[PDB]
C-alpha cells in the first residue's frame, strides 16, 4: 500500500532515481510526518528542518513553485513535536476550500522553504530545488 | 466559556482510533487543516452508491465526572450527493446519535442493539466545492444532551444509513454554574442539574471575618447561573463592606455592632487603636462607662458647684447647691455628701462620723440639689463635703476638688441690720450702704437685697447677692419709687428684713 | 395540559385552506383518520422523483395572544422512498420550518425570501407500509421555539425539497404558570418569559381573612412552572391554616395573635363566643385583666386568711396572717390594711381614721404576710380588716369577706398561768389540765403548747394549738419524761411561758 | 376534473343509469361529502341520513357487502355539522394501515346502512342496494 512519507533530508527516498512517485489507489490514505527531531529518534533528521507542505499543480511542481494562497496541507513548525498530516483519496474531507483530484493529472507535495525558521514563508523553490524534495502522485484512474 | 469539557477530538494531535463497524469501506478517520488553521482529526463516510448502510462509529470510554446532564456538540458537512460522479438520486442528509452508559472503559465491540438513540440529527446544509484557502463558516453545529447519567462514563456511537459526511469535531462537555461571591458569602462550582424542572440547591460558608446572620442559600439553574439570592452574611465587628473579602477598620475607626454601615471615625477625646478596632480606647484622664454606649464620646470627669447655701436648726442642718459648672457630657448626676467633724478644734487632723448620721431624702447618690441632715449632736462644731458623681466617676480617677462648707450645730441665727442708707441718688442708678447686724452668731457670708415697686402691683422681687457692705442698682426708669430691704445670710441661719428705705428716683 | 393553543389543525373539521406555492402538484390537502379514531385534515407532498423541488406551505395568520415565545409542535411521517416504485437513490428525510412575523392577517402571497428558518427538521424515523387497523404511534413528534415575537401574530411555513411527507398535524402553542394556592398566598395565572435565561417575577396577594407578615413572590420559569417561594402569608387572628382560605375557629376556639399553630380551645371559666373570635370572653363573675394574657384563665377573686395572730406594744401594733386557702389562679398576692377604730364603744356605728396613721412596711398592696403599724393613740380601742388583693380583684367586683381582729392599745399583754396539770398518764398519751391566766388584759383567743426532750439534744418544739382549756399527746414512746409549756394568746398581745411540768411516760 | 360526491338520497347521481362511476387520474383529489342538513341548505336531503361509507374491493362491492373491520372513509354522525373526507390518488397519505390501489382493479365506494342512526354499524347493503348507494372508481392505469 503507501507508506508515510518523513519530509526531512534524513528521508533520501528523495535523492532517489524516478523523484519519489507515489501511485495511490481511489481509497487509499496517505500520512506525511515531521517527526519530533528533538530528542532526536529514528526517522529524524541532523537537526529540525523548518518545512511548509504544499499540494500544487503538478505543472507549477515541476516549477517548484507554489501559487498564490497555496493549499498548505502541514506545517512543522515545532521541533518538539512530531507533526502528521492524512489524506483520504475521498469525496469528504475536514477541508472547507473544495478543492478537488482530477484523475490522469499530476500533482506534487512540495516544500519550497530552504528548511530554515527564517526561509519558512518562501513560496518559490527551496528545498524543492536543493534537495530535491517533492512528491508526484498519480492517482488511480 | 462557562462549560468543561470531557471530550475534544479537537484536542488529539496523534489519532482518536475510535473503533468503527465495518473498520474498513466505512466510517474513516483523515486529517484536516480546521477554522483555526490547525490540523486535527476527523471521521467521514461516503458511501452513497451502495445500499443498505449501516456504518457504526464509537467513540471511545468518556467519564461523565459525576456530571448527570451532559452536551454533545457535534461540527459536520455533507457533500452533496449530487456532484459526486454517477449519484442522481435523492441523498441522504442525516445521521444517528446513540450512547451507552457502562462502568467499562474497554468494550471491546460495538453491540448495536445495546446502543439508545439520542437522536437522528438532520444536515441544515450541504456543500459541492471543498473551501480551499480560508475557512467559511458552512459547518452543521447540532448540540443535544443525554441524561440523568448513573454510571461512570458512557459512549456515543454514530451511525450512517449512506449520507456523504464528515464529522469535523465532536466535544462532549457539561455546563456549571461559576465561583461567584455575593451577599458577602462565597459560593463554589456547583454542576448542572439532570432535568431542566429540577433545581439545586447551593449553601457556601462565608467569609473568615464575618458572622452569618442569616442562612445563605443559591439556585444552580440547568443554563449554568444562578436565579435568586436567599440570606446575606453581615461583616463582623470591626470589618466594612468590600468588592471581595470583609475590610477591617483602618488606624481611627471603629464598628462595636455588625452593621451594614461602614466604619465610624473615633469619638471627641479618644486614642486612636490599631487597624481593626471593635470599639476607640480613650486616653489618659478620660474614661468611659460599661453601661454607656459606645458611639458616646469619653467623658470629662464632672465639676463641684462652687456655691454652697445653709441653713442650721437645734439638731438639724439644711444645705443648698446650684449645677455644676462642667457637666463633661453625662445626664446622670449624682452627688454624695462625707460628713466629716473636722469643725471642732483648732488643727486640722479629726476623728470620721463613726456614729449613725441620719439624712433622709437619700444616703450618697442624691438626684436632686436639696439635702438635709438630721440626729447631729448640739454644740459641736461640724463639717460636710459634697462630692459630685457621675457615671464615669467611679471608672475615672477621683475628682481632684469638692466644694465643702463647715457649720456649728446649737449656735443661732443672724439678726437683722439696725439701718441702712442711701449715698447716691440718680435718674440711672442708687447707691446702697448698710453695717453688719448687732448679734453675728456666727461668721457672715452673704447680703440678699431685695427690691420692689410702689404704686403699682406686685412684680416679682430683684435678687441681688453681695458679700461686700455695698452695691449699686442698675437699669431703673426714672419716677419710680422703691422699696429696699437687706438680708444677712450666715451657714447658722436666716436673717431677718431691714428697715424699709422708700428712695424716690 | 398547561399550555395555551394558538393553532391545532386537528381542531379543523372543514378545511384548512392554507396557501401553497405551488398550489397543485406540491403540498396538498387530505383527510385522515388519527390515533384518536378522529378524522383530522392534513398536508403532504411525495414528489421524490422531481428534481428542484421548493414546495412552500404556508399557514393562516396566528395571533400570539400577547405570548412573546411560541412553541410548534409539528407530528409528520417520511415514506420511505425506496418503498416507491422506481425510485432507487438515498432518500431526503427532512423539511425546513420558517416564521413572518406580521401586523397583516391577509397577506396574499408567499413571500419566499421575507420568510426566517426556525430549522431544518428531520425525521428520526421513516415507514414502508400505511397502518390498517389501530393506530401505532411512530409518528415523528419535532417541538421549536420562536420569540420574543414583537408584532400581533405570525406565520409558519413549511419548505419541502423533495421528500415523501405527511404533516400528520401543526399545534402552536405558548406555556403557562397555572393559578395556585401555596404558603397561604394566592398566585394568578402568568405567562414564560421570552428568554430561558430570563425568569418572571410572581407576586400575588394574599388571602381577605389574612394578614401580610412576610411579602410572597414566586418565580415563573420557562416550562411553565414556579421555581423557589418566598415570603409566607400568616393567617389573621380568630382564623386557622386551611387547604384554600384561611378557616375560622368554630364556636368554643380563640387565637388572640397571628401564629401557625391551629385555634386554642376556651380557658376554664369562660364563656363560648360565635364562630371566629379573637379571645373567648369571660361569663359572669370572672372577669379577666388588661396587662394579663389572653391564654390565662378566667379569675376566680382571691380568700382571706383565715388565721390572725396580733401583739401589741404600748403604742405600736405588729400583725401576721397566713397564705390564702383559695389563690384563684394568680401569682400576684398582695394584702391591703383597713383603719377603722369600731373597737371603741359598745355601737356597732363608728368614725373612720381621719388621723395619719403610720405602717413602716407597705401603706397598701403588701406582698409579705408580715406587716406592723406604729403611732396608734394609747388608751382607745382600734380594729384593723386585712384585705386581700389579686390583680383581678380590680376588674373583679369586690370580694365578700376580709378577715379582721380587734385589739387594745395601753392594756398590756396577756399574763401567764399559774398551774398546769396532768390528767391522765399512759405510755401513748397524757393528758394535760390548765386554767386561763390570772389578768387577761383581753378576750383570750388561743393557748399554744410546747413540747421537749429531755436527757437528750434539744430537738424542734412540738407546736398545738387549742383554744380549748383542755388538750390530749399523740404518738410517744415509752420511759420519755417530757417538760410541758403551755402559752396564752390574745390580739392584744403575747403571752408568757407557764410552769414547767415534768412528767415521765 | 373530479366533482364532490354528495352522500344523501339528495344526489340523484345515484339513480343515474351506468350507476356513479368516476374515472380518477393519478394526482387526482376527490372528495366525498355529508352536507349539514339542520340548517337546510343546497345539496343537503329532506332529512339527515346516517351512514358511514367504507371503500371496497369491488367484488364485495358488487355484492353490497362490506368485509369484517372495513376501510371506514367517512361516518356521518353529525346533523349539525358539514362532514368531508378527501383522498388524493397518490403514495402518502395520513392513513396509517398500509392500503394500497391496485390499477386495473374496481373498488367500490359503499354504504351498507339503511341511512338511520339505528341502522349505521350495519355492515351488508343496506341504502347500497335500497337506494343503489355505491360509486365505483376506476384509477388510471
Same mark, same amino acid.
Given at each position: =500500500?503507501?507508506?508515510?512519507?518523513?519530509? +526531512?533530508?534524513? +528521508?533520501?527516498?528523495?535523492?532517489?532515481?524516478?523523484?519519489?512517485?507515489?501511485?495511490?489507489?481511489?481509497?487509499?490514505?496517505?500520512?506525511?510526518?515531521?517527526?519530533?527531531?528533538?530528542?532526536?529518534?529514528?526517522?529524524?533528521? #541532523?537537526?529540525?528542518?523548518?518545512?511548509?507542505?504544499?499540494?500544487?499543480?503538478?505543472?507549477?511542481?515541476?516549477?517548484?513553485?507554489?501559487?498564490?494562497?497555496? +493549499?498548505?496541507?502541514?506545517?512543522?513548525?515545532? #521541533?518538539?513535536?512530531?507533526?502528521?498530516?492524512?489524506?483520504?483519496?475521498?469525496?469528504? =474531507?475536514? +477541508?472547507?476550500?473544495?478543492?478537488?483530484?482530477?484523475?490522469?493529472?499530476?500533482?506534487?507535495?512540495?516544500?519550497?522553504?530552504?528548511?530554515?525558521?527564517?526561509?519558512?514563508?518562501?513560496?518559490?523553490?527551496?528545498?524543492?530545488?536543493?534537495?530535491?524534495?517533492?512528491?508526484?502522485?498519480?492517482?488511480?484512474? | 466559556?462557562?462549560?468543561?469539557?470531557?471530550?475534544?477530538?479537537?484536542?488529539? %494531535?496523534?489519532?482518536?482510533?475510535?473503533?468503527?463497524?465495518?473498520? &474498513?469501506?466505512?466510517?474513516?478517520?483523515?486529517?484536516?487543516?480546521?477554522?483555526?488553521?490547525?490540523?486535527?482529526?476527523?471521521? %467521514?463516510?461516503?458511501?452513497?452508491?451502495?445500499?443498505? %448502510?449501516?456504518?457504526?462509529?464509537?467513540?471511545?470510554?468518556? @467519564?461523565?465526572?459525576?456530571?448527570?446532564?451532559?452536551? /454533545?456538540?457535534?461540527?459536520?458537512?455533507?457533500?452533496?450527493?449530487?456532484?459526486?460522479?454517477?449519484?442522481?438520486?435523492?441523498?441522504?442528509?442525516?445521521?444517528?446519535? $446513540? $450512547?451507552?452508559?457502562?462502568?467499562?472503559?474497554?468494550?471491546?465491540? /460495538?453491540?448495536?442493539?445495546?446502543?439508545?438513540?439520542?437522536?437522528?440529527?438532520?444536515?441544515?446544509?450541504?456543500?459541492?466545492?471543498?473551501?480551499?484557502?480560508?475557512?467559511?463558516?458552512?459547518?452543521?453545529?447540532?448540540?443535544?444532551?443525554?441524561?440523568?447519567?448513573?454510571?461512570?462514563?458512557?459512549?456515543?456511537?454514530?451511525?450512517?444509513?449512506?449520507?456523504?459526511?464528515?464529522?469535523?469535531?465532536?466535544?462532549?462537555?457539561?455546563?456549571?454554574? !461559576?465561583?461567584?461571591?455575593?451577599?458577602?458569602?462565597?459560593?463554589?462550582?456547583?454542576?448542572?442539574?439532570?432535568?431542566?424542572?429540577?433545581?439545586?440547591?447551593?449553601?457556601?460558608?462565608?467569609?473568615?471575618?464575618?458572622?452569618?446572620?442569616?442562612?445563605?442559600?443559591?439556585?444552580?439553574?440547568?443554563?449554568?447561573?444562578?436565579?435568586?439570592?436567599?440570606?446575606?452574611?453581615?461583616?463582623?465587628?470591626?470589618?466594612?463592606?468590600?468588592?471581595?473579602?470583609?475590610?477591617?477598620?483602618?488606624?481611627? $475607626?471603629?464598628?462595636?455592632?455588625? *452593621?451594614?454601615?461602614?466604619?465610624?471615625?473615633?469619638?471627641?477625646?479618644?486614642?486612636?487603636?490599631?487597624?481593626?478596632?471593635?470599639?476607640?480606647?480613650?486616653?489618659?484622664?478620660?474614661?468611659?462607662?460599661?453601661?454607656?454606649?459606645?458611639?458616646?464620646?469619653? *467623658?470629662?470627669?464632672?465639676?463641684?458647684?462652687?456655691?454652697?447655701?445653709?441653713?442650721?436648726? &437645734?439638731?438639724?442642718?439644711?444645705?443648698?447647691?446650684?449645677?455644676?459648672?462642667?457637666?463633661?457630657?453625662?445626664?446622670?448626676?449624682?452627688?454624695?455628701?462625707?460628713?466629716?467633724?473636722?469643725?471642732?478644734?483648732?488643727?486640722?487632723?479629726?476623728?470620721?462620723?463613726?456614729?449613725?448620721?441620719?439624712?433622709?431624702?437619700?444616703?450618697?447618690?442624691?438626684?436632686?440639689?436639696?439635702?438635709?441632715? @438630721?440626729?447631729?449632736?448640739?454644740?459641736?462644731?461640724?463639717?460636710?463635703? /459634697?462630692?459630685?458623681?457621675?457615671?464615669?466617676?467611679?471608672?475615672?480617677?477621683?475628682?481632684?476638688?469638692?466644694?465643702?462648707? *463647715?457649720?456649728?450645730?446649737?449656735?443661732?441665727?443672724?439678726?437683722?441690720?439696725?439701718?441702712?442708707?442711701?449715698?447716691?441718688?440718680?435718674?440711672?442708678?442708687?447707691?446702697?450702704?448698710?453695717?453688719?447686724?448687732?448679734? !453675728?452668731?456666727?461668721?457672715?457670708?452673704?447680703?440678699?437685697?431685695?427690691?420692689?415697686?410702689?404704686?403699682?402691683?406686685?412684680?416679682?422681687?430683684?435678687?441681688?447677692?453681695?458679700?461686700?457692705?455695698?452695691?449699686?442698682?442698675?437699669?431703673?426708669?426714672?419716677?419710680?419709687?422703691?422699696?429696699?430691704?437687706?438680708?444677712?445670710?450666715?451657714?447658722?441661719?436666716?436673717?431677718?428684713?431691714?428697715?424699709?428705705?422708700?428712695?424716690?428716683?
Amino acid at each position: =500500500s503507501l507508506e508515510p512519507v518523513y519530509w +526531512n533530508s534524513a +528521508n533520501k527516498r528523495f535523492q532517489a532515481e524516478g523523484g519519489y512517485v507515489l501511485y495511490p489507489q481511489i481509497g487509499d490514505r496517505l500520512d506525511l510526518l515531521c517527526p519530533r527531531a528533538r530528542p532526536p529518534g529514528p526517522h529524524s533528521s #541532523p537537526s529540525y528542518e523548518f518545512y511548509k507542505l504544499y499540494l500544487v499543480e503538478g505543472a507549477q511542481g515541476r516549477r517548484c513553485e507554489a501559487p498564490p494562497a497555496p +493549499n498548505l496541507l502541514l506545517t512543522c513548525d515545532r #521541533p518538539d513535536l512530531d507533526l502528521r498530516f492524512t489524506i483520504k483519496f475521498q469525496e469528504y =474531507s475536514p +477541508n472547507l476550500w473544495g478543492h478537488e483530484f482530477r484523475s490522469h493529472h499530476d500533482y506534487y507535495i512540495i516544500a519550497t522553504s530552504d528548511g530554515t525558521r527564517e526561509g519558512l514563508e518562501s513560496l518559490q523553490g527551496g528545498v524543492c530545488l536543493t534537495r530535491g524534495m517533492k512528491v508526484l502522485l498519480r492517482v488511480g484512474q | 466559556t462557562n462549560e468543561v469539557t470531557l471530550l475534544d477530538s479537537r484536542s488529539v %494531535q496523534g489519532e482518536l482510533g475510535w473503533i468503527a463497524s465495518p473498520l &474498513e469501506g466505512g466510517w474513516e478517520e483523515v486529517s484536516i487543516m480546521d477554522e483555526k488553521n490547525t490540523p486535527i482529526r476527523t471521521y %467521514q463516510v461516503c458511501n452513497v452508491m451502495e445500499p443498505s %448502510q449501516n456504518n457504526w462509529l464509537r467513540t471511545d470510554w468518556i @467519564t461523565r465526572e459525576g456530571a448527570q446532564r451532559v452536551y /454533545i456538540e457535534i461540527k459536520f458537512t455533507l457533500r452533496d450527493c449530487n456532484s459526486l460522479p454517477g449519484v442522481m438520486g435523492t441523498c441522504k442528509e442525516t445521521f444517528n446519535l $446513540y $450512547y451507552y452508559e457502562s462502568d467499562n472503559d474497554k468494550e471491546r465491540f /460495538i453491540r448495536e442493539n445495546q446502543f439508545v438513540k439520542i437522536d437522528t440529527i438532520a444536515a441544515d446544509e450541504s456543500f459541492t466545492q471543498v473551501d480551499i484557502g480560508d475557512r467559511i463558516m458552512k459547518l452543521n453545529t447540532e448540540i443535544r444532551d443525554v441524561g440523568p447519567l448513573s454510571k461512570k462514563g458512557f459512549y456515543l456511537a454514530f451511525q450512517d444509513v449512506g449520507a456523504c459526511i464528515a464529522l469535523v469535531s465532536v466535544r462532549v462537555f457539561y455546563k456549571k454554574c !461559576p465561583l461567584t461571591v455575593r451577599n458577602l458569602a462565597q459560593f463554589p462550582d456547583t454542576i448542572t442539574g439532570a432535568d431542566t424542572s429540577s433545581l439545586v440547591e447551593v449553601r457556601g460558608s462565608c467569609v473568615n471575618n464575618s458572622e452569618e446572620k442569616d442562612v445563605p442559600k443559591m439556585y444552580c439553574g440547568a443554563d449554568g447561573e444562578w436565579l435568586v439570592p436567599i440570606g446575606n452574611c453581615l461583616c463582623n465587628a470591626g470589618h466594612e463592606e468590600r468588592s471581595g473579602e470583609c475590610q477591617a477598620c483602618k488606624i481611627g $475607626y471603629y464598628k462595636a455592632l455588625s *452593621t451594614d454601615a461602614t466604619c465610624a471615625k473615633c469619638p471627641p477625646h479618644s486614642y486612636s487603636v490599631w487597624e481593626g478596632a471593635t470599639s476607640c480606647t480613650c486616653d489618659r484622664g478620660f474614661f468611659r462607662a460599661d453601661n454607656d454606649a459606645a458611639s458616646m464620646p469619653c *467623658t470629662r470627669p464632672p465639676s463641684a458647684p462652687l456655691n454652697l447655701i445653709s441653713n442650721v436648726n &437645734e439638731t438639724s442642718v439644711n444645705l443648698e447647691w446650684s449645677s455644676p459648672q462642667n457637666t463633661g457630657g453625662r445626664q446622670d448626676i449624682s452627688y454624695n455628701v462625707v460628713c466629716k467633724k473636722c469643725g471642732a478644734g483648732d488643727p486640722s487632723k479629726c476623728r470620721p462620723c463613726g456614729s449613725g448620721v441620719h439624712y433622709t431624702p437619700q444616703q450618697n447618690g442624691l438626684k436632686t440639689t436639696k439635702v438635709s441632715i @438630721t440626729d447631729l449632736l448640739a454644740h459641736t462644731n461640724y463639717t460636710f463635703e /459634697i462630692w459630685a458623681v457621675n457615671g464615669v466617676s467611679k471608672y475615672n480617677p477621683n475628682p481632684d476638688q469638692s466644694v465643702s462648707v *463647715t457649720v456649728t450645730t446649737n449656735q443661732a441665727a443672724p439678726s437683722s441690720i439696725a439701718l441702712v442708707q442711701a449715698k447716691e441718688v440718680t435718674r440711672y442708678s442708687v447707691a446702697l450702704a448698710w453695717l453688719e447686724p448687732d448679734r !453675728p452668731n456666727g461668721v457672715i457670708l452673704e447680703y440678699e437685697v431685695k427690691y420692689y415697686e410702689k404704686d403699682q402691683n406686685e412684680r416679682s422681687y430683684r435678687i441681688v447677692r453681695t458679700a461686700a457692705r455695698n452695691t449699686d442698682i442698675k437699669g431703673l426708669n426714672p419716677l419710680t419709687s422703691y422699696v429696699f430691704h437687706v438680708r444677712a445670710r450666715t451657714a447658722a441661719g436666716y436673717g431677718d428684713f431691714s428697715e424699709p428705705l422708700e428712695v424716690t428716683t
